[PDB]
Symmetry: C4
Subunit: 194 residues, 4 copies
């Protein structure tokens, strides 16, 4: 287990970084849990690994790892496989902890998020707290309008998300333009209930 060694080795550097910058014990413990939920005691230079492979193998891997998320939402489940692949390839896996501000209402949004696992709270103003969990996405509004976030989104529980930047978003829709409607339909239904 050299990957395991990579984790333990890397985390010790994180413990020293925190010590050097004299971070509180509360924060250090948070950092700790983050690494644990995010990496799970095993680290690999995924960029280097996948870079050693080819397109097919890479697409095959991403499709397999995201298999859960795929069948989870209609968008990818009934869509063109080549669309699904192109989209997944651009996704960035991120892990958020309870209470984190995934989206802060009022700021220029540049990313949307797909929920693989977890629950988020949506504060539009006073009281919404609408909840979103496994199988749904959020943040598509500003990717479509290029304006300010119309709401706040925080992690309720531990959230295993996949982010997509506005640029990679438009890059994919450059090839599958009709798929942009799926995101619009959702952004409209949403802006409507407000």
């Amino acid at each position: 287990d050299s990957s395991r060694r990579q984790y333990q080795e890397k985390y010790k550097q994180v413990e020293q970084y925190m010590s050097f910058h004299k971070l509180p014990a509360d924060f250090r413990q948070k950092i700790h849990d983050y690494y644990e939920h995010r990496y799970q005691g095993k680290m690999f230079d995924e960029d280097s690994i996948l870079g050693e492979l080819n397109g097919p193998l890479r697409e095959e891997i991403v499709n397999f790892n995201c298999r859960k998320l795929v069948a989870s939402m209609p968008l990818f489940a009934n869509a063109d496989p080549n669309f699904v692949t192109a989209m997944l390839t651009k996704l960035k896996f991120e892990v958020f902890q309870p209470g984190d501000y995934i989206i802060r209402e009022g700021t220029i949004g540049k990313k949307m998020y797909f929920i693989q696992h977890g629950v988020v709270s949506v504060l539009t103003k006073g009281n919404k707290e609408m909840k979103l969990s496994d199988g749904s996405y959020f943040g598509e509004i500003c990717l479509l309008t290029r304006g300010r976030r119309t709401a706040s989104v925080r992690a309720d529980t531990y959230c295993r998300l996949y982010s997509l930047s506005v640029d990679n978003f438009n890059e994919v829709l450059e090839e599958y333009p009709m798929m942009r409607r799926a995101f619009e339909t959702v952004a409209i239904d949403r802006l409507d209930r407000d």
Copy 2:
């Protein structure tokens, strides 16, 4: 043999990556063979190596390694040596396995491929399966039209190819503009038989 060590060391990380992401035994074995045909039990940071050298040495190396491919097709064999060099420098060696989708008809193409060794099948629609092997290239159509792939291309056997992106393609033709005809002649003969 430290390079050999680099390979074995790197592959073990790949074995752990796959285990962590619980990939099937069929896939793991495919990955395995890929690394074997692609690297052949020896890894070097080629980017770092060549970066330590200078232009002449680098060009000399690429010309020597691609020597086979060069004499293999008319394009490079009778062309201006400086054209041949400029072109080779931009090439990316890739290895495809039996059944892989090198090109998927209908997608916006951004790369063309030169076959050093192997055989590919060309599906234009129903039944073509035209075959291409050592000494020929494919994918130049979209590099010239900037449109969709007019056919599918899959690896029949194990394929040792060299890819060229549309940007590096136009960059070279910026200096040897007349050489663009060679690719056109082929793209026309081809679009003609359709």
Copy 3:
């Protein structure tokens, strides 16, 4: 202490670099002290560390490390927290030694500096030497005019600064445009006393 090892290990390479390039004993000793005041016997790949984290954790860290600087000047102390964060994220910590030319009058300026700790001398021409220390910034003039430096700025004592490039400067003001006045007010008061 592997970080400590990283420092000692890295500094020995610096000692050999200097030896190879036969640098004077005076300079070598300066380099030495630089590493000591800048790193303090402990090195971490901060880019790699923070890259392993997420946005929230990263912002939390930068806010904590810069906490001193924040309460130190009005600009960040009474400003919008999201503005403060966005700004800090773009800051680059730098350490200058006694007598260094932080800004050389007459050159096209592209960076401004916030003083966390230290004292600087401002030569406008003959004799000014106006002094600036903890809690104030300089260099905003050219970030606003895109012209030449209107004065020279040198480190009196050892200076622990934070730099901000003109691009990252305008990027933040793209989201908090009204905050640009704070820098203008200061650039005007200053150009006025000249």
Copy 4:
């Protein structure tokens, strides 16, 4: 001597790279000598080293290392020190071996070269072989015209040069526009003797 170890360690990888690609014994020996004249048995990650420093220290280092070249040619010797520094910072040290084609007449030139040590031959067509050695530069013609190389330039002896790309060239002249005349005067005298 860990730097020495870095060299020997790195060169062994180069020996294995060459073996893997079955390069001739003549070439391997050339590569060998290159590493020897270029690095001299000691390797350091200069990019990483200098990146750990600050602007002043970096400029001080480059000025010291290039001190020879500076006093060697009028251009830097009588010029504005800030011009000299800006220029040096953009220079790339390169080492050419006897018989190498530094510049190949007829190609779109993007770099000029300053000779620290060595002698080059200039073939304009039949017979020139004009020689240039320590203290002079070449290649400025295309940086000024953005056209084709008007001559060939080869290393006679072992050449220790410093290159400057057209972009970094125009970037510096953006700040010291009048200094562009120095290069013009030389490009004119030269085009004149043709």
